[PDB]
Amino acid sequence: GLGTARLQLVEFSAFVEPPRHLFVHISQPPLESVDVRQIYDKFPEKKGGLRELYDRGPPHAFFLVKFWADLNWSSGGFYGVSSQYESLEHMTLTCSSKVCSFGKQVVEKVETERAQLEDGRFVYRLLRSPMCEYLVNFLHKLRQLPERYMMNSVLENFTILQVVTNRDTQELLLCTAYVFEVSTSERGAQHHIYRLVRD
Ligand X SMILES: CS(=O)(=O)NCCc1c[nH]c2ccc(OCc3ccccc3)cc12
Residues that bind ligand X (CB under 6 A): 14, 23-24, 69, 81, 97, 99, 109, 129, 131-132, 135, 160, 162, 178, 180
Least distance to ligand X from the beta carbon of 41, Å?
A: 19
CB of 23 to ligand X, least distance (A): 4
Which residue's CB atom is positioned nearest to ligand X? 109
Q: How far is the CB of 70 from ligand X (least distance, A)?
A: 8
Minimum Å gap between C-beta 119 and ligand X is: 25
Contacts of 60 (CB under 8 A, 6+ apart): 4, 195
Is residue 124 helix, strand or coil? strand
State which residue, 81 or 91, has the beta carbon closest to ligand X.
Answer: 81
Residue closer to ligand X, measured from CB, 51 or 109? 109
| Minimum gap (Å) between residue 134 Cβ and ligand X | 8
Q: State phi, psi for 37 to the nearest 5 degrees.
A: -55, -20
Q: Which of 50, 52, 31 is nearest to 160 (CA)?
A: 50
Closer residue to ligand X in complex, CB, 81/164 = 81
Tell me whether residue 90 or residue 134 sits nearer to ligand X (CB atom): 134
DSSP string spanning 100-115?
A: EETTEEEEEEEEEEE-
Pick 63 or 180: Cβ nearer ligand X? 180
β pairing state of 8-16 and 21-27: antiparallel
* Nearest-angstrom CA–CA distance, 44 and 170: 21
Rounded (5°) CA angle 17-182-111: 50
